[PDB]
């Protein structure tokens, strides 16, 4: 079980900087293609490809094949409520 | 706004260490004194009360008053679930 208590710890710190953290919020929203995050941060796609390779590692992210361009989307909604709840706590001004 | 941005990052690197995310565990299922949280990593009180101060400081945990024993708690049932929801998608039996 130390194998699990170990990952639970990689999880969170795969969402340390938060320039990823917004990108998350765009998707939750709505899914997009490479190059339409480019209008979020912009830059290029190079950049934006390379990153998306590092959270199909972790298994939070998802990629799919749908004619010549590759759609992406959150996993489940499982991480939809995560960050919910999270500015949830965050903003408890009740009332 | 971007004043919010940055809290919900102190949020989860406030959970780093596992040490930390394990004496969570505890609270989750039981509350617990400080001597009593002892048993659990054992070795010297002043220790625990020290660090147990630094989650009040983010909110996370709340303190309360009972006669002449100071019990600590779980926040709302808020983080009782994250923490699951974690390990729910950590760990996807498929099949």
Same mark, same amino acid.
């Given at each position: 079980? &130390?194998? &699990? =208590?170990?990952?639970v &710890? ?7 900087? !938060?320039?990823? /953290?917004?990108?998350?919020?765009? =998707? %939750?929203? %709505? ?9 979020? @941060? ?7 490809? #390379?990153?998306?390779? @590092?959270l199909?590692?972790?298994? @939070? ?9 590759? /759609? !992406?989307?959150?996993?489940? /909604?499982h991480?939809? &409520?995560? @960050?919910?709840?999270?500015?949830? #706590? ?6």
């Amino acid at each position: 079980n &130390t194998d &699990t =208590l170990e990952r639970v &710890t990689e999880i969170f710190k795969a969402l340390g900087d !938060y320039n990823r /953290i917004r990108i998350m919020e765009l =998707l %939750s929203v %709505s899914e997009a293609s490479v190059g339409h995050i480019s209008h979020q @941060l912009n830059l290029s796609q190079s950049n934006v490809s #390379h990153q998306l390779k @590092l959270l199909k590692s972790v298994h @939070l992210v998802k990629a799919k094949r749908q004619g010549q361009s590759m /759609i !992406y989307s959150l996993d489940d /909604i499982h991480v939809a &409520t995560m @960050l919910k709840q999270a500015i949830h #706590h965050a903003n408890h001004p009740k009332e």
